[PDB]
Design a protein around this nucleic acid. Structure first.
Lengths: 168, 184, 82, 33, 254, 146, 94
RNA sequence: CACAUUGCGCCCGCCGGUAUUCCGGCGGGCAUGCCUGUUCGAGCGUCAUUUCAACCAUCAAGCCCUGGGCUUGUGUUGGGGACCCGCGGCUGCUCGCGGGCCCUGAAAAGCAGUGGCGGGCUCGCUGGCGGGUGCCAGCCGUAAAACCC
């Protein structure tokens, strides 16, 4: 699912710092001697959140390793409340390469071109079937609790130290 | 582990190969080459993983089994038909004199008793060949370039050319020489 | 509008999410030095409304100060000594 | 037999979902000066 | 540092600037020239032209060897092509000046001795076969030597051509070199006992004769009319073996 | 000994028996496999049934490849409970479903010569069919001779 | 102030001196030890040497039987009737 | 660096003494915290990496009544609807091939049927001969051939 998402997302990568200058130079040279609206991947936490609140984002991808987790902890609930399909992608750096940055906390797609409208729609169904149904019950549950053999020995030892007397 | 996409990718690849082979068969001699007896160099390149049985035999006869393999072939009616079949897996074109000279000298090898023996002296040139009048390596170059009566004997003697991946470098005409220059 | 969501979250400091994050982060700061540079604000909304910008020249240093009193009470605040 | 079948099924499941790509003392390394 | 920036760009999917950074790298596989400029190193190592002439012996032995060797990763194909060009350009200078003096046939190859401004230069050229590379042979060590020698010979060639009066570099015909002209693809233009041995003579070289050694020897010692079979390459005075005006024909056949 | 039955559907074009056998034999062992097809044309109906000899393998493989998006097709891996597994389900299993050119066979059978004696009494049956059509043309008000 | 745009095809299409120009003799430093020249070839090395230099059939088989880096010289003189029969030297690159 | 003694370290260069090695002198530099950037790194901190691409004829060949027209270049997801037909079998009902109308996301829950040729496997008889096969990512259409070698 990550590969299929990034296949569509790569076709809508924003222009680099070098490419934008060349396009600006091309138009400047032409005038010295009328275009369709650009379609691109939206990035920026404040930008994407406003798109979700205004119900403009068709698909939202959220990183799983934001260092202050409180920056994105509300995003899945907000996406669910608005009816926006969402998925969690392993890697803020992987999202960064998509937008030619070191790190992207969240990326979004608002509108794609006509040749990719059907591709985006299929990926929307794939995510909500392949990901959202799989976490419909586990998103309400507490995580953790992966005690290994060493942890289990400590817990059993702790109980037997309080079986006889409990100093308080 | 082999993924489900690769299974579907290979089938659709085989389906198209079965298509073009059928068309090539029905309109045999599809390539519109004038009737000429000249020289073409053929290089085996990366392509479809599962080769269909008919192209598989053709690559075997031409000794183009490994990648980066090169051979000299005369453009007869059978050879042009054969090369058309193996078009997806080969890069081919007409060599030039410098290309032939560089290949037979720098990377020249010969088959003696089924063994890969380098062309280090003319003694083995006139021992294997020579009954056809080829006593030096230059005679071998002459017979390959100005293709003559004993091109077949000269060709089978020449072990397939094991070239090297270029370092930053259909009928390709003389542009096969640019590929040879980089790949040599 | 992520910072408005952060403002409300920081109001609920005893909530399960914030209590959990504050518990783990307290242990981590304790393993570090008393005064050390923080590469990034842990409360970006709070830092932003106090005048922090993401320019070259703005730094965050976090510090822990022993709490309590000297029965005498210091007229300045524990935040002032930090 | 049953354990071998279960191990093979689990190994294929892990590859399908996650792919196939997965003296003693410490000194400050010498760096360029 | 540049290689690190190329690797980061390549590993991030932005091939446009990775190609842009590659152009700054000056890689030998694309340019065919040495990666680092060694003009000041050569100047301090050879403070005068005389010192450069005294150590041309090892320089020419390397370059003529690598002009016959296959292309490796340390020394790519375009690097070897420049070795042919420099060696061919050098051979033209001796032909015009008649600076070639001696030549010797040995079981190890062919020895050429020349005299430039009073220094004897001796170098060995391998026989034109499939040279063998076996055992532990390191082309990175030899690549470093090739890099130094090509820069040295290129500057030596420029000064020698300027002293005569010819322009440098000589005009090179890619089409003729494609046809197999080898030494015959160079045109030498100006700027605006030796030459009598084979002067009024005419030779035809058969197929089994070594074209490159014979042509160098004859053309340096006076000959102006040399022909060979068309398989040997473009540039022969005549190709028909039945040409009446052929005094000598060199053969090596039973 | 509890064989398991898998129901796979929404298959992409090309995910046929050999690929279904090859991919799922990596998960475990395959006993029988059938891809449903048409008699009129040799084309798959984008669903298939796979029987594993080990029940646990069928459970693991169905969970992993259930909602798998393959060439634009989101797959469907559902385990058929052993109750409603039809006794006659793997009948063309392990057999190649070759395409028969029924149009060529039926059409050329109209070409092969034969004594038209029964054809002429069929011509009389054609006449009586024409008479029935003539009744259908009475409300039309159409007259046509022979 | 700035250059106008040009198409990438045109950019690709668009894109020597005397080292000893100011040269004077300098005194040779005594710390330099120049490597000696390899000795010039002798009469043993020619492809058609005088018969005296040729060895005996026994003196040959002992030579190839002896392992390298134990021989007085890295070659034995050999006589060839023609340049055509002179083989490539196997230790040229080495 | 050292209560600072005009003493002693380390790096780069120079000068004078028989000097490539020795001596002495001279010049330029070597404190801590912190910031911005550079380059060199560390981490059983986290992630990606067995590539779902394009690739038929963007025109060719042959013709005719000489300039327009003609012929050949076989290339289609599946399923459903008391709808209207043509043609073949079926005693008949009905079933097949092909149409016209309508619906559906690249949608889906047994309903497997038409005779062979060559190859593989397997079984019998004397390498050969004679039978079977829900095996052929090999062909054909009911014989058979081709492929194959």
């Amino acid at each position: 699912l990550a590969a299929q998402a990034f296949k569509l997302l790569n076709k809508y990568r924003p222009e680099t710092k070098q490419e934008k200058k060349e396009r600006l130079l091309r138009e400047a040279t032409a005038i010295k001697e009328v275009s369709k609206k650009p379609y691109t991947v939206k990035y920026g936490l404040n930008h994407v959140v406003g798109l979700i609140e205004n119900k403009k984002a068709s698909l939202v991808l959220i990183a799983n390793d934001v260092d202050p987790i409180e920056l994105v902890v509300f995003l899945p609930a907000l996406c669910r409340k608005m009816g926006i399909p969402y998925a969690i992608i392993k890697g803020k750096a992987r999202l960064g390469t998509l937008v030619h940055k070191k790190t992207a906390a969240v990326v979004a797609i608002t509108e794609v071109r006509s040749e990719d409208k059907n591709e985006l729609a299929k990926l929307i169904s794939a995510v909500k079937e392949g990901y959202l149904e799989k976490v419909e019950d586990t998103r309400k549950r507490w995580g953790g609790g992966i005690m290994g053999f060493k942890a289990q020995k400590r817990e059993e030892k702790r109980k037997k130290s309080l079986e006889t007397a409990i100093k308080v | 582990f082999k993924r489900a996409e690769k299974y579907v990718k290979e089938y659709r690849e085989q389906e198209r190969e079965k298509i073009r082979l059928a068309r090539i068969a029905k309109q045999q001699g599809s390539f519109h080459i004038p009737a000429e007896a000249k020289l073409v160099f053929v290089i085996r390149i990366k392509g479809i993983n599962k080769i269909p049985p008919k192209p598989r035999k053709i690559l075997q006869l031409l000794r183009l089994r490994q990648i980066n393999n090169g051979v000299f072939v005369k453009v007869t009616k059978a050879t042009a038909e054969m090369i058309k079949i193996v078009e997806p897996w080969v890069a081919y074109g007409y060599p030039n004199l410098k290309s032939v000279r560089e290949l037979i000298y720098k990377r020249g090898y010969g088959k003696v008793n089924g063994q890969r023996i380098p062309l280090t002296d003319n003694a083995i040139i006139e021992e294997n060949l020579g009954k056809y009048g080829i006593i030096c390596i230059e005679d071998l170059i002459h017979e390959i370039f100005t293709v003559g009566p004993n091109f077949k004997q000269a060709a089978n003697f020449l072990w397939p050319f094991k070239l090297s991946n270029p370092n930053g470098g259909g009928n390709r005409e003389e542009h096969i020489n640019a590929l040879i220059r980089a790949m040599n | 509008g992520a910072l408005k969501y952060l403002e409300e979250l920081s109001k609920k400091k005893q909530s399960d999410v914030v209590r959990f994050l504050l518990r783990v982060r307290c242990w981590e700061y304790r393993q570090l030095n008393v005064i050390h540079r923080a590469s990034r604000p842990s409360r970006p909304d709070k830092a932003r409304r106090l005048g922090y910008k993401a320019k070259q020249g703005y730094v965050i240093y976090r510090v822990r100060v022993r709490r309590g009193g000297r029965q005498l009470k210091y007229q300045r605040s524990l935040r002032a000594t930090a | 037999s049953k354990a071998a079948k279960g191990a093979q099924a689990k190994k294929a499941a892990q590859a399908a979902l996650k792919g196939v790509h997965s003296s003693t003392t410490f000194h400050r390394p010498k760096t360029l000066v | 540092a540049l290689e690190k920036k190329i690797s980061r760009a390549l590993g991030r999917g932005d091939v446009s600037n990775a190609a842009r950074l590659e152009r700054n790298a000056n890689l030998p596989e694309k340019t065919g020239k040495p990666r680092y400029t060694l003009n000041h190193i050569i100047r301090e190592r050879y403070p005068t032209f005389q010192d450069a002439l005294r150590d041309l012996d090892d320089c020419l032995s390397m370059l003529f060897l690598f002009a016959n060797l296959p292309s490796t990763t340390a020394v790519p194909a375009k690097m070897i092509a420049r070795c042919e060009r420099l060696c061919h350009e050098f051979q033209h200078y001796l032909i015009v000046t008649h600076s070639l003096r001696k030549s010797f046939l040995s079981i190890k190859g062919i020895y050429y001795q020349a005299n430039i401004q009073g220094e004897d230069i001796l170098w060995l050229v391998p026989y034109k076969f499939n040279q063998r590379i076996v055992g532990d042979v390191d082309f990175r060590i030899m690549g470093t030597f090739v890099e130094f020698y090509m820069t040295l010979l290129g500057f030596v060639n420029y000064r020698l051509y300027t002293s005569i009066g010819l322009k440098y570099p000589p005009k090179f015909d890619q089409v003729k070199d494609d046809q197999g002209a080898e030494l015959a693809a160079f045109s030498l233009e100006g700027l605006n006992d030796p030459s009598q041995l084979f002067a009024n003579f005419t030779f035809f070289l058969s197929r089994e004769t070594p074209r490159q050694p014979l042509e160098f020897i004859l053309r340096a010692f006076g000959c102006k009319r040399i022909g060979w079979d068309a398989v040997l390459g473009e540039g022969a005075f005549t190709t028909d073996e039945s040409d009446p005006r052929i005094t000598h024909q060199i053969i090596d056949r039973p | 000994s509890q064989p398991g039955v898998m129901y796979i559907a929404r298959l992409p074009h090309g995910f046929y028996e050999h690929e279904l056998r090859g991919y799922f034999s990596q998960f475990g062992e395959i006993t029988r496999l059938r891809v449903v097809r048409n008699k009129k044309t040799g084309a798959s109906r984008h669903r298939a049934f796979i029987e594993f000899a080990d029940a646990e393998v069928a459970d693991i493989a169905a969970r992993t490849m259930d909602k798998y998006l393959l060439f634009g097709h989101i797959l469907t891996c559902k385990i058929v409970p052993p109750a409603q597994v039809h006794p006659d389900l793997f009948k063309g299993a392990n057999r190649r479903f070759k395409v028969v050119p029924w149009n060529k066979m039926a059409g050329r059978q109209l070409e092969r010569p034969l004594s038209e004696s029964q054809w002429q009494v069929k011509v009389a049956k054609e006449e009586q069919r024409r008479a029935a059509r003539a009744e259908k043309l009475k409300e039309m008000g159409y007259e046509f001779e022979a | 102030r700035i250059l106008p745009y040009k198409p990438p095809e045109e950019r690709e299409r668009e894109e020597f001196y005397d080292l000893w120009q100011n040269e004077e003799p300098q005194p040779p430093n005594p710390m330099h030890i120049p490597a000696p020249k390899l000795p010039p070839p002798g009469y043993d090395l020619s492809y058609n040497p005088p018969p005296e230099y040729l060895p005996t059939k026994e003196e040959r088989e002992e030579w190839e039987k002896m392992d390298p880096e134990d021989r007085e010289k890295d070659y034995l003189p050999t006589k060839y009737d023609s340049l055509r029969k002179v083989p490539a030297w196997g230790n040229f690159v080495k």
